[PDB]
DNA sequence: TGTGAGCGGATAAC
DNA sequence: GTTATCCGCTCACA
């Protein structure tokens, strides 16, 4: 097993101590001694056990993220940023994937996340109010900062306004002077979903409108497609559709595609997300923005703030905005 | 500060051995002390603080694995798929991300790894050979398993057979008549894009074939759009082009048709990975299949082989297929 | 099951 | 520049 500070001890003609100072940048060292103590763990190799650093009282700033399957989209991209932006701020980051839906996944999450002693929890899963209030609870004595959660949970979170998102893709439909439209939501079970099919609902209510149709997707463009073709057979042809997400716009595309319709020029879509692929579709899908690099950094920023006590409590709206491609004529 | 092994003890008026063996599954045990202990920490809330249990000697295969950025498609695709299997068996993972290009970030990387002594190492990390036995080197008596390095390089390695899949490819084209191809290579700081362009060359040239044209891309949409945009400006056009992955095939699709030509019947085309989203494209395409989540399965369970100085030593290559769709006319 | 000593180090006084 | 000694636990012993 690994170099022991003991091993440079002998290997240098030195004590434990003596090795710890050289180390540790010390105050009063031999002045020669630390040349050849340093040359001692040089030639030998030694790395810090930090699971012992730790335990024996380093104050080492760790945040610990548990988030939805990395298969995803969005969570990727989010993890990437957050591991960036703490890296760049001398922060470690330690993941813990809930893969099983329900509470008690995302709690065995926190509980591992818990016992690697992190200083702040970042919570990239779907979870109900009483639920994230839950989890907020069993988030002994440490800071945590909810991602996938409602505006209105009382605790803190940060999250795309969802509110300008539908608006923004509502009232340009309209601009273009669209009213029969339909909709085609993410699944459900998730939080950030539902969001979104209210924002439509909302807004499309404020022009006088309904949906002429309402489907339920499950994030892949599979199902975009899937959903968009039964919605097709049952004879309910739209002039525009508001999709969860860009891969189910794609789906979605495709069905009116291979329908013998015109993206655009007989039934215009509208994604979610802009994701990079998205800006490549065919025809160029048109979106809403979504700045996961903005979100993930923000999540470290944030997460770092609350563990320094500092008045920052509650939920943040990050803004987003509408990209017009080709898929809205 | 969480509840300790010694809260439990007065809480239960036993000792924290006492508790340790309840915890343990233990041998012997009081019988309905048992009962009693169990019950006193699950009023309170007990989470085995992990960083002590590592240190005082508790044996977990902790995996560490350093990738590139998860902000990419099949990197992620892969953490997924280990993590998933690591906790399927009992087994913890922690992962370093590399975003900096270079060797010494990698090794950056493994050295944080390393210092959480984990019990072994998957590096899926773009390595020359020389640079891959100086991490291998660096791998302080634990095992390291490589993912992108070449079949060639003298270490262990899983990776999916460029062999087979551009061979698939180029024999797929060619079966259809085609003469006139292009190639539209991954970056080469990419060990797997340069395996693949070989493969085509390798292939191409069984047949008596020269690409008429042959470009770089980033693994991006964009790119392969720019790329086979200025390929088209050129003059040159192709009857069918290889594409070293699908989201670049894509690109090139986008600029196919926008371009007045029909993918299929005037260009056709193959991608790489057969990702989610590659099958429903416009229209779907036709490419080479890779089983992240096998890659990822496998990874971890010959990580422990090794672990375990079983002999299974070397390299090992893990199957692909053609899935045709409808790109290739 | 009650007891006692080492893991790899860090402070905080000695 | 030591030096004693606790961090939070796991066993090996008794
Ligand atoms: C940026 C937002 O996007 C959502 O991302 C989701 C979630 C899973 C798969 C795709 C998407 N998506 O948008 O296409 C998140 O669930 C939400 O919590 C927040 O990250
Ligand atoms: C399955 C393989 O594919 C490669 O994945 C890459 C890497 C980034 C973006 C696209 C692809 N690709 O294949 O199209 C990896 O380099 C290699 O490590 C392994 O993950």
Redesign the interface.
């Known amino acids: 097993?690994?170099v022991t500070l003991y091993d440079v001890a002998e290997y240098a003609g030195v004590s434990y101590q003596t090795v710890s100072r050289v180390v540790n940048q010390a105050s009063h060292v031999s002045a020669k001694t630390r040349e050849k103590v340093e040359a001692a763990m040089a030639e030998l190799?030694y790395?810090?056990?930090?699971?012992?650093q730790?335990?024996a009282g380093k104050q080492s700033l760790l945040i610990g993220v548990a988030t939805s399957?990395?298969?995803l989209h969005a969570p990727?991209?989010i993890?990437?940023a957050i591991?960036?932006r703490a890296?760049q701020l001398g922060a470690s980051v330690?993941?813990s994937?809930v893969?099983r839906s329900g509470v008690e996944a995302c709690k065995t999450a926190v509980?591992?996340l818990?016992?690697?002693?992190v200083s702040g929890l970042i919570i990239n899963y779907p979870l109900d109010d009483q639920d994230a209030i839950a989890v907020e609870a069993?988030c002994?004595?440490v800071p945590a900062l909810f991602l996938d959660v409602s505006d209105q949970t009382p605790i803190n979170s940060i999250i795309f306004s969802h509110e300008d998102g539908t608006r923004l893709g509502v009232e340009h439909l309209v601009a273009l002077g669209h009213q029969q439209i339909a909709l085609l939501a993410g699944p459900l079970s998730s939080v950030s979903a539902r969001l979104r099919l209210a924002g439509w609902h909302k807004y499309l209510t404020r022009n006088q409108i309904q949906p002429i149709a309402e489907r339920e997707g499950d994030w892949?463009?599979?199902s975009?497609?899937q959903q968009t073709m039964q919605m097709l057979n049952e004879g309910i042809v739209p002039t525009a559709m508001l999709v969860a997400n860009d891969?189910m716009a794609?789906?979605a595309?495709?069905a009116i595609?291979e329908s013998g319709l015109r993206v655009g020029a007989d039934i215009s879509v509208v994604g979610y997300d802009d994701t990079?692929?998205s800006?490549?579709?065919?025809p160029?899908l048109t979106t809403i923005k979504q700045d996961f690099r903005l979100l993930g950094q923000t999540s470290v920023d944030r997460l770092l703030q609350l563990s320094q006590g500092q008045a920052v409590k509650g939920n943040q709206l990050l803004p987003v905005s509408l990209v017009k491609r080709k898929t809205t004529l």
């Open positions: 097993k690994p190799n790395i810090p056990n930090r699971v012992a730790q335990l399957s990395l298969a990727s991209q993890v990437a591991k960036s890296d330690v993941v994937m893969e509980h591992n818990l016992a690697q002693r069993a002994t004595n892949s463009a599979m975009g497609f891969q794609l789906g595309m495709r595609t990079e692929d800006s490549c579709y065919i160029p």
